[PDB]
Amino acid sequence: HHDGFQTVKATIDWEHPMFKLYEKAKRNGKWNPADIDFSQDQKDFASLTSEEKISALPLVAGFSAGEEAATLDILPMAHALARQGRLEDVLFLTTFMHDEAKHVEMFSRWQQAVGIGQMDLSVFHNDHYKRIFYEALPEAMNRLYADDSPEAVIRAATVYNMIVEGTLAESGYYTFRQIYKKAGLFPGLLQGIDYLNMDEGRHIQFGIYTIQRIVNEDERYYELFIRYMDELWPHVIGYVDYLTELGKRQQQLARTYALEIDYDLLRHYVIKQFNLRKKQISRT
Amino acid sequence: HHDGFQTVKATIDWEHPMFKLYEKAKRNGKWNPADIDFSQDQKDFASLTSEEKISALPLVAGFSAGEEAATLDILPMAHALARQGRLEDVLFLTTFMHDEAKHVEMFSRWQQAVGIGQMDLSVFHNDHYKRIFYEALPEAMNRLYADDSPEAVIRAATVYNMIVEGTLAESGYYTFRQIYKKAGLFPGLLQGIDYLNMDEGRHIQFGIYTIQRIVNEDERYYELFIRYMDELWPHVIGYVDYLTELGKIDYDLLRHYVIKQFNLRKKQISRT
Ligand SMILES: CCCCCCCCCCCCCCCC(=O)O
Ligand SMILES: CCCCCCCCCCCCCCCC(=O)O
Ligand SMILES: [Fe+3]
Ligand SMILES: [Fe+3]
Ligand SMILES: [Mn+2]
Ligand SMILES: [Mn+2]
Ligand SMILES: [Mn+3]
Ligand SMILES: [Mn+3]
């Protein structure tokens, strides 16, 4: 039952950080995947040999499942904060969920447009990927339906916002630009990636806000945050090494397009993101 | 756990009715309550007598709580359809939920602007209103966390989309126009109502789609729909009568609009 309603008894807290993030989301979130022109992407993909065609699909396979999981698995966080009466967080999360829906749509439209929608891309999810996206992420979020303790909320935001979004997604955006933007391939996908990257800035800020406000009540949760980050790192880098090894064994695209794909630079960027996400949470 | 992902094994079902409704929601759902100019509404409100001021508040109190319940209480429907693999339904429901968030925002901005944000409008929720919005609606939606049977889904969509939205919300939009537009009062609020009414057409279309697809599998669910509608009617009309009595423009015309909405929502679901 509802005991009452904040906007009947009072008003929205207009100065709440998540209300302000909600306002930015509305201003900055107007893009529509359906407006992206993928016609040149189709031409580029058809121009590639079978070998070069593969080069791109592991990254896309990882994003497409990632966005779909993101759309499904944010709902328990919205429920948990709703039940706690955090109306402004809920408002913001409506924009978060609608963002992820557009991300799912964007990658699916690209697969359809380039002619691979019929191809099962699950073959590029190795065991580490599945540990994060098929298992740990839904387990951490779904926990919130029966356990919305500070410990549970911190773990959910860590896995979702700090690891999946703040480490993997961010490193995937960078990787996409380092490879396909340099090669001049897939302009529509790159337009998508840039929209996604803009959206993701708000999603990571929500996670930072959430974790920090819990750490602010008891700095003992800071150690829990660090620990959960470190627990998932082996699967983060396990997946990144899988992708790297795939890239190193599929050299055709980089040769054709005169790219010196510095995979050691990519790996360094992932480590960099992981440690900088840790640093955006303060003990005090 | 996730067993797999539809957009990795295949793609979105581009022809799915809720994907089409999602596409329409993006194209038609751009409005922003922060852009509505409420400055004249403030002046209009200040120009009313004390008694006229209090005459406007019950309808607003009904809506502000209704939108807030709507925002919170659609989440279990999104979860249950997600768990069923109904990906295109979920995509659409992200636009549904963000719509209700903007509706909450719009009424609260109006209350702030005209100077009543500090006033507790719960005084204007009577027992019938509470039965629907404080109790039956959250009860029926939250049930979906543990029971997503066809019967539970039909009941949730009946209470939410056909009664709260399809009967009360639609009747409130009409009421605001019949009263305040003819009076030339609260133009910002009426711009908001127009945007809300446009959004609401999609929300009601989702409820129709959901209820009919369950009815299509077994015609005995049609009788459940009708029964759930009738069960809620006494509270619908008990709240409407309470509002009508406070006002004492043609209240009988308004009251008949509610009955008309109720019946036509019933008619939009087919036995066969
Ligand atoms: C070769 C370097 C590897 C870099 C790592 C690439 C990671 C690709 C996986 C993308 C999944 C991101 C899902 C985002 C979820 C969200 O949007 O909230
Ligand atoms: C004087 C005649 C009364 C007519 C009916 C007035 C009803 C007021 C509306 C309250 C509920 C609105 C909540 C709808 C939720 C949504 O937007 O989905
Ligand atoms: Fe995200
Ligand atoms: Fe609605
Ligand atoms: Mn391994
Ligand atoms: Mn009564
Ligand atoms: Mn995303
Ligand atoms: Mn509404």
Author numbering:
A (entry chain A): 3 to 286
B (entry chain B): 3 to 250, 263 to 286
What do the paper's sentences say?
The heterodinuclear Mn/Fe cofactor is found in the R2 subunits of subclass Ic ribonucleotide reductases (denoted as R2c) as well as a related group of proteins known as R2-like ligand-binding oxidases (R2lox). Although the physiological function of R2lox proteins is not known, the cofactor catalyzes formation of a tyrosine–valine ether cross-link in the protein scaffold. Two proteins from this group have been characterized to date, homologs from Mycobacterium tuberculosis and Geobacillus kaustophilus. Both contain the ether cross-link, and both co-purify from heterologous expression hosts with a long-chain fatty acid ligand bound in a hydrophobic channel leading from the protein surface to the active site, hence the name ligand-binding oxidase. The two metal ions are bound next to each other in octahedral geometry by two histidines and four glutamates, with the manganese ion occupying the N-terminal metal-binding site 1.
